[PDB]
Write a protein that binds this ligand. Structure first.
Ligand SMILES: NCCCN1CCN(CCCNC(=O)c2cc(O[C@@H]3O[C@H](CO)[C@H](O)[C@H](O)[C@H]3O)cc([N+](=O)[O-])c2)CC1
Ligand SMILES: NCCCN1CCN(CCCNC(=O)c2cc(O[C@@H]3O[C@H](CO)[C@H](O)[C@H](O)[C@H]3O)cc([N+](=O)[O-])c2)CC1
Ligand SMILES: NCCCN1CCN(CCCNC(=O)c2cc(O[C@@H]3O[C@H](CO)[C@H](O)[C@H](O)[C@H]3O)cc([N+](=O)[O-])c2)CC1
Ligand SMILES: NCCCN1CCN(CCCNC(=O)c2cc(O[C@H]3O[C@H](CO)[C@H](O)[C@H](O)[C@H]3O)cc([N+](=O)[O-])c2)CC1
Ligand SMILES: NCCCN1CCN(CCCNC(=O)c2cc(O[C@H]3O[C@H](CO)[C@H](O)[C@H](O)[C@H]3O)cc([N+](=O)[O-])c2)CC1
Lengths: 103, 103, 103, 103, 103
C-alpha cells in the first residue's frame, strides 16, 4: 500500500495533486436530487467537489464518499489545515479522491 | 457540475437563495411520527425546514437529507456562520435544498 | 409543516411542552436488552427518556430516535442550552418527541 | 422505565454499579477479529469493556453497542466526568451495560 | 477478554506494539477505488495504515474498520496523544489492529 497521498494519487489516471496548506474557506452541501454533493473552496479561489455517487464508482467507494463529506465538514468547522488533495481532473470542479491534513 | 450554491440552486424549479451571513439562532428536531424533521431559525425571524422524507424525494436524496440534519445540528452547536441557503419556496417553512458556510 | 416545536407538539395527543432554558445536567445511556434507551435530567431533577423502540413507533421514527440520542449526547457534552422539549406525558419518565435549542 | 442508572441496573442479573465520578483515564479500541471491542480504564485502575457482539445479545442491542463505543470515545476526548457505570460482573473486564455522565 | 492493548495484541500472530506517546502528525484518507484507506504519520516518521477492507477480514471487522478511521480522524483533529498502536507488521505500512489513548 502507498505511504502517502502523492504515491496513492499516482496509482490512478486522470489525477493530480493540489497543494493547499490552508484551511477550507467555504463548505457547501446539497440534498437536491441528482446534486447530492459537497463543494469546498479555498481563499486562493480553488474549488473542489465530492462527486454525486454514480455508475463510475465501485461498491467499496460508497462508504468512503460519505466519509469524505464527513471529513470535509469537520475540517471546515475546526479550521483544520488541508495539506494536499488528490483529485480527478476530468471533472469540473476537480473531484476529490483523497485528502491529507497536517500542521 | 455547478461550482457554488447559487449556480446549483438555479438548476431547480421553485427555488431561491436566501443570504443569511449569520449563525443559526435555534435548532429544533423531532422524532414524532410523520414529523421526522428539523427546523432552524435565524435572529432575523427566518424559519426553514428540512422536510420529512416523502415520495417527492428520489432514492439518492434520502442519505443526503440525513446528512443535512447532521450538518445543521453541528453548525448550530459550533455557531458557524451560514452564508446562504438554497430553498424550495413552494413549501412552508421554505425547505432546505443546500447550505453554504463561509465567513 | 410546523413553524416551531410548540405547533409541532400540538399535532399529537398525550403531549406537552416543557420549557427549560437550561443545559442538560446528566446524560445516561443503556445498551441493556429491552432497555436500549437514554435518560436525561436537568438540575432541578426533571427527567426525560428517549424510549426504547417499540411497537408504537412507525418505521420512519427509528432513524429519528437514533438521531435524538446523538443530539442529546452532543448537547450534554457541549453544555448547549435546551429551550423546550415536546414530550409524551403518558410515559414515565416523559418521553421525548422533539427538542429545541436556542441560546 | 427506570428514572436513573441505579434503578436500571437493578433490573438485571449479574450486575453492579461502579461509582467513578471521574474522567476516563485511557481509551482503547480494536478492530482485530473476534476482539472488535473497546476497553476503558480509570485512574483508580478499574477497567471495563464494551463486549464483542455475541449470541447473548439480542438484535435491539446491536445499535446500542455501537453507540456505547461512540459515547466512550467522545467522553474520553472531552474529559467528561463519568458518574456511574452499570456493568455485568460475570465478565472480565466487567462489561458495560449503561453509563451516566454528570458534573 | 484482554485488559489492555498489549495483551490484546499478543493474542494475534504477526503483530507488535508501537509506543508513540504523541499526537498524530498527519491524517490522510482516500475514496479512490481499491484504496479506500487511511494513513497516519507521527513526527518521528512512523507511518501506519488502516487497511482497505478485504478477504482477510471477517464480517465483524468491517464496522470496526470504519470506526477506527473515525477514531483516527477525531484523534488527529483534537491533537489527542496516542499511547500505543497494535499493528500487524506483515504489511507495509504496518496495519493498525488497535489503538490506545492516554494522557
Ligand atoms: N446531472 C443531472 C442534473 C440535472 N438535473 C436538473 C434538475 N433535475 C431535477 C430533478 C430532481 N427532481 C426534482 O427535484 C423533483 C422535485 C419534485 O418536488 C420537489 O421536491 C423537492 C425535494 O426534492 C421539494 O420537496 C419541493 O418542494 C418539491 O416541489 C418533484 C419532481 N417531480 O415530480 O418529478 C422532481 C435533475 C437533473
Ligand atoms: N403527513 C402529515 C403529518 C402530520 N402528521 C402529524 C402527526 N400525526 C401523527 C401520527 C403518528 N402516530 C403517532 O404518533 C401515534 C403514537 C402512538 O403511541 C404513542 O407513541 C409515541 C411515540 O411515537 C409515544 O410512545 C407515546 O407514549 C405513545 O402513546 C399511538 C398512535 N396510535 O395509536 O394511533 C399513534 C400524523 C399527521
Ligand atoms: N419491556 C420491559 C423491560 C424490562 N426489562 C428489564 C430487563 N429484562 C431483561 C431481559 C433481557 N435479557 C438479558 O439481559 C439476558 C442476558 C443474558 O446474558 C448476559 O448478556 C449480557 C449482554 O446483554 C452480558 O454479556 C452478560 O455477561 C450475560 O450474562 C442472558 C439472558 N438469558 O439467558 O436469558 C438474558 C427484560 C425486561
Ligand atoms: N477470542 C479470542 C480472539 C483471539 N483470537 C485471535 C486469533 N484467532 C485466530 C483465528 C483467525 N485466523 C487468522 O489467520 C487471522 C489472521 C489475521 O491476519 C490477517 O488479517 C489482518 C486483518 O484482520 C491483517 O490484514 C494481517 O496482515 C493478516 O495477516 C487476522 C486475524 N484476525 O482475527 O484479525 C485472524 C482466534 C481468536
Ligand atoms: N489498485 C490500486 C489502484 C489502481 N487502480 C488503477 C487501475 N484500476 C483499474 C480498474 C479501475 N478502472 C477505472 O477506470 C477507474 C477509473 C476511475 O476514474 C473515474 O471514476 C472516478 C471516481 O472513482 C472519477 O469519477 C473519475 O472522474 C472517473 O474518470 C477511478 C477508478 N477508481 O478506482 O477510483 C478506477 C484499478 C485501481
Amino acid at each position: 500500500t502507498p505511504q502517502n497521498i502523492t504515491d496513492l494519487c499516482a496509482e490512478y489516471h486522470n489525477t493530480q495533486i493540489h497543494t493547499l496548506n490552508d484551511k477550507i474557506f467555504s463548505y457547501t452541501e446539497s440534498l437536491a436530487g441528482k446534486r447530492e454533493m459537497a463543494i469546498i473552496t479555498f481563499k486562493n479561489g480553488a474549488t473542489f467537489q465530492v462527486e454525486v455517487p454514480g455508475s463510475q464508482h465501485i461498491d467499496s467507494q460508497k462508504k468512503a464518499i460519505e466519509r469524505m463529506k464527513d471529513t470535509l465538514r469537520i475540517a471546515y468547522l475546526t479550521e483544520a489545515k488541508v495539506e494536499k488533495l488528490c483529485v480527478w481532473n476530468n471533472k469540473t470542479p476537480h473531484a476529490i479522491a483523497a485528502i491529507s491534513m497536517a500542521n
